[PDB]
């Protein structure tokens, strides 16, 4: 069991502790300041973007 | 009606790949049939996936090729690596 915030939705089917997980930007992070990535950029928790009419925010590893 | 030669008379009927039609007054009127989807991999990594789209990736791991959603109906993964 090693998450790594990009195998979330994955499902673990086949370093960091017990909580604590992987980001992709280096120590172990906490499943609630888990950052977004978006065409190969890495976006912090509560970032702004916009697609073309909209707004966007990510949340806790996801976009709202 | 026309559909590719064949002239059609007002009311005659024809099976199209997933819908039937019926030739209306000059146009035709077609109700939608059922019919599946298919998912392809071909090659070392052509991905096709169920609406078209076909693409390339070359990749290296383990990957969900299809999960169902709901919460354990079904998952199938996958194996390209470099050979």
């Known amino acids: 069991r090693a998450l790594s915030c990009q195998t979330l939705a994955a499902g673990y089917y086949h370093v960091c502790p017990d909580g604590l997980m992987d980001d992709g930007r280096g120590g172990c992070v906490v499943e609630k300041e888990c950052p977004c990535v978006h065409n190969n950029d890495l976006y912090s928790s509560g970032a702004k973007i916009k697609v073309d009419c909209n707004t966007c925010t990510c949340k806790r590893g996801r976009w709202v | ?83």
Do not use: M
């Not at chain 2, 209306?24 to 599946?36: F, H």
């Not at chain 2, 789209?53 to 999960?67: E, N, P, Q, S």
């Not at chain 2, 169902?68 to 194996?79: I, K, T, V």
């Open chain 2, 1 to 83: 009606c026309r559909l590719h030669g064949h002239l059609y008379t007002p009311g005659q009927e024809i099976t199209n790949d997933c819908e039937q039609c019926v030739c209306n007054a000059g146009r035709w009127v077609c109700k939608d049939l059922p019919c599946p989807g298919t998912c392809a991999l071909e090659g070392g990594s052509h991905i096709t996936t169920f609406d078209g789209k076909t693409y390339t990736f070359h990749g290296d791991c383990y990957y969900v090729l299809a999960k169902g959603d709901h919460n354990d109906s079904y998952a199938l993964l996958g194996e390209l690596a470099p050979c």
